[PDB]
Amino acid sequence: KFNDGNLNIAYAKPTTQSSVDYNGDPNRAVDGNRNGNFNSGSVTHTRADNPSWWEVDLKKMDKVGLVKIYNRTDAETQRLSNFDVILYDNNRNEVAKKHVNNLSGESVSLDFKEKGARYIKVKLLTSGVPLSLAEVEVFRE
Numbered sequence: 001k002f003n004d005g006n007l008n009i010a011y012a013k014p015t016t017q018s019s020v021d022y023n024g025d026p027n028r029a030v031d032g033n034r035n036g037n038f039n040s041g042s043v044t045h046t047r048a049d050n051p052s053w054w055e056v057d058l059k060k061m062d063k064v065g066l067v068k069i070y071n072r073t074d075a076e077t078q079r080l081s082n083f084d085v086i087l088y089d090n091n092r093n094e095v096a097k098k099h100v101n102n103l104s105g106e107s108v109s110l111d112f113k114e115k116g117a118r119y120i121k122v123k124l125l126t127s128g129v130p131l132s133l134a135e136v137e138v139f140r141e
């Protein structure tokens, strides 16, 4: 459960996603493994939904600082583009949202500046595109 010395509170928490394809179950983004090669088994994959999304449930509200999202790396890297990262409280009210146009390397790091949330959702805004995430790490700082 550790990354840059900080506790990743998303590790091993319940996850869900819009659908599953190629056995790319949602729990692959919280298994502690950042390997972005889909074929090695640590990357999620939805079907081509309207739109595709993935979510982690921390089970209780917690403070969210950095969110670090590791992309698929073996192929189709541009799929993780034009997406929202969205925080929701215990009643699924939206508490914060950042939009990411694209990634320049293998990850993007967002800072939600200590906002209280239970759910972190990653949502593609382009429908008909599968969502694959190698890992989603969530920190209190």
Ligand SMILES: CC(=O)N[C@H]1[C@@H](O[C@H]2[C@@H](O)[C@@H](CO)O[C@@H](O[C@H]3[C@H](O)[C@@H](O)[C@H](O)O[C@@H]3CO)[C@@H]2O[C@@H]2O[C@@H](C)[C@@H](O)[C@@H](O)[C@@H]2O)O[C@H](CO)[C@H](O)[C@@H]1O
Residues within 6 Å of the ligand: 022, 038, 074, 075, 076, 130
């Ligand atoms: C350039 C690059 O690295 N990838 C191309 C390429 O991707 C497909 C090929 O690598 C192909 C070789 O047989 O395998 C495809 O995945 C298959 C899985 O290997 C197989 O287990 C599963 O049952 O079926 C899929 C689909 O045929 C590669 O497709 C990519 O990865 C899969 C997991 C999925 O995300 C798919 O949408 C991807 O395209 O060729 C495709 C042609 O459409 C693209 O040009 C990739 O960028």
Ligand SMILES: [Ca+2]
Residues within 6 Å of the ligand: 028, 029, 030, 031, 032, 033, 034, 035, 042, 043, 133, 134, 135
């Ligand atoms: Ca993983």
